Amino acid sequence: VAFGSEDIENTLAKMDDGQLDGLAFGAIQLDGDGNILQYNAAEGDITGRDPKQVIGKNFFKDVAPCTDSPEFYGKFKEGVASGNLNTMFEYTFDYQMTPTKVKVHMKKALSYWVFVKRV
């Protein structure tokens, strides 16, 4: 299934760890506070983070400080509160990694998904 699909959250609701690892794009599931619930292999291939050891950490505070901005975290908090998170934007990831341009799609789970692909 494809990055940015209209019903991506339906598909991914059905998936186990291995299936999530099979996705063509990075996929992170966060709680409303930004704690990491799921993190797939494709994401780790972009960021050099071991998916097994980031589970439970806080994405915005600890893992991904560069995303702590109105343009990313602010859009996340707005969507958690309004209940209708579904937004796509370009971003650069550059904390403890080579600076890497990405496209991000955040979407409420059918918990909140952050999907990532290289650009």
From Swiss-Prot:
Keywords: Chromophore, Photoreceptor protein, Receptor, Sensory transduction. Disulfide bonds: none annotated. GO terms for biological process: phototransduction; regulation of DNA-templated transcription. The keyword Membrane does not apply. Coiled coil: none annotated. GO terms for molecular function: identical protein binding; photoreceptor activity. The modification S-(4-hydroxycinnamyl)cysteine is found at C66. Residues 20-83 form the PAS domain. Signal peptide: none annotated. InterPro entries: PAS, PAS-like_dom_sf, PAS_fold, PYP. The 4-hydroxycinnamic acid (p-coumaric acid) chromophore is covalently bound via a thioester linkage. Belongs to the photoactive yellow protein family. Photoactive blue light protein. Probably functions as a photoreceptor for a negative phototaxis response. Monomer. This is Photoactive yellow protein. It comes from Halorhodospira halophila. The lineage of its organism: Bacteria, Pseudomonadati, Pseudomonadota, Gammaproteobacteria, Chromatiales. The gene is pyp.
